Amino acid sequence: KNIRKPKQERSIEKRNKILQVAKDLFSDKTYFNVTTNEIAKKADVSVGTLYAYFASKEDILTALLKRYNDFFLTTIFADINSQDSLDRFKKNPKEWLNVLINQLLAAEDKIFHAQIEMLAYAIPQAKALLEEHNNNLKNLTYKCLLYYSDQAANPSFKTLSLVVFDFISALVDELLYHEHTQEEAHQIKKTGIDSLDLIIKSYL
Amino acid sequence: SIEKRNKILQVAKDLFSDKTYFNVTTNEIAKKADVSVGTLYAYFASKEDILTALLKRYNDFFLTTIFADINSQDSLDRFKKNPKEWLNVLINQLLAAEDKIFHAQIEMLAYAIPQAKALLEEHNNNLKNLTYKCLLYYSDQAANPSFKTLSLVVFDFISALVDELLYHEHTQEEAHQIKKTGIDSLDLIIKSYL
Numbered sequence: 160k161n162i163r164k165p166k167q168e169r170s171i172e173k174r175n176k177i178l179q180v181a182k183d184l185f186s187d188k189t190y191f192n193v194t195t196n197e198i199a200k201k202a203d204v205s206v207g208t209l210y211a212y213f214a215s216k217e218d219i220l221t222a223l224l225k226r227y228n229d230f231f232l233t234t235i236f237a238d239i240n241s242q243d244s245l246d247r248f249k250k251n252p253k254e255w256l257n258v259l260i261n262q263l264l265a266a267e268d269k270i271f272h273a274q275i276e277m278l279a280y281a282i283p284q285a286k287a288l289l290e291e292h293n294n295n296l297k298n299l300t301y302k303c304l305l306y307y308s309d310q311a312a313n314p315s316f317k318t319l320s321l322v323v324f325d326f327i328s329a330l331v332d333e334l335l336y337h338e339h340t341q342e343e344a345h346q347i348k349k350t351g352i353d354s355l356d357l358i359i360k361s362y363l
Numbered sequence: 364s365i366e367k368r369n370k371i372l373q374v375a376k377d378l379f380s381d382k383t384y385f386n387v388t389t390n391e392i393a394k395k396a397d398v399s400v401g402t403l404y405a406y407f408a409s410k411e412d413i414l415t416a417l418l419k420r421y422n423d424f425f426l427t428t429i430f431a432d433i434n435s436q437d438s439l440d441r442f443k444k445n446p447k448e449w450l451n452v453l454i455n456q457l458l459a460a461e462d463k464i465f466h467a468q469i470e471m472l473a474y475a476i477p478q479a480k481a482l483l484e485e486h487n488n489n490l491k492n493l494t495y496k497c498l499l500y501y502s503d504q505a506a507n508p509s510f511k512t513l514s515l516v517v518f519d520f521i522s523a524l525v526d527e528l529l530y531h532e533h534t535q536e537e538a539h540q541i542k543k544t545g546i547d548s549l550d551l552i553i554k555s556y557l
Contacts, residue, residue: 189475191385280471318540329523354552
């Protein structure tokens, strides 16, 4: 019993293996084309064992979405949601854009994220998750706008935060999920940035 | 029969939208269209065949109605007159798009079904190319790599604005402010390069 072995229990290993296998299957085949049988086989567990851990395929999804939320908050949002961003924006709105777009472009796990976007059309948890993340990024954007003029609240800045982030996110997607040369990606980013700078400055 | 094929496509379209495509079966379509499983099969071998027929219809409708107008010489002239008036017109046409509910299902399906992804990318590339043609026409230029880049950015922003308005709940006043902010901003960006 007290012999040299990993601290993590076998039941946790198998649970983690199921989740990683399902995540990868969902990512590659899309969620609706993946069967419970296929998940069990690829995880090297019986179908009965898979059901002991997860009552349905959607319960597996619930668990993966929760993990993506933490990944988002810890690896992408923590640096964006910082006085650093507010300071940067106050000094020059253009440098705020440059840094933010790089942060969003640096976001990892784009393959599974795409699957969450698909699932937003069909699965309420997926829609809610992405709306919350989007809302947090819009709110950060709103806070930067307020910080520029040292305001407490401004409805027109809230509306602007929505439009500006929607455009930012559109630019990120063009760069992330579409094929471009290094040079074409550079020009899209520059045109996008210069354009968003002019817009933001027009309302400040 | 022709009429029955149309009824089935009508029914299948409504089902795909209400329920999620992946969850709808051919049996379900047959039952809702009041037709036998054998009859339906005679019309369409698989569910994917029904979808292809709906996608082909969507393509022809995009090409013949909405894209034909956007791609007209008349459209080029409006841009040259006032790009803001052109923006207003295009954005209002996009906001009034027919079959928006089914279109969202196509957007979802584009992640899983190559033909749906291909179709939407063609329509998006079409709209970007027209935008480019508009910029060239304004300037009387044959080619401009900076305007080609611009056309991608601008159309991406246009699409983002339309989606914000179509897919999210806003008070009447907020929706008016989002639309106005969006349009004014696009007009500002376009004019900065002209």
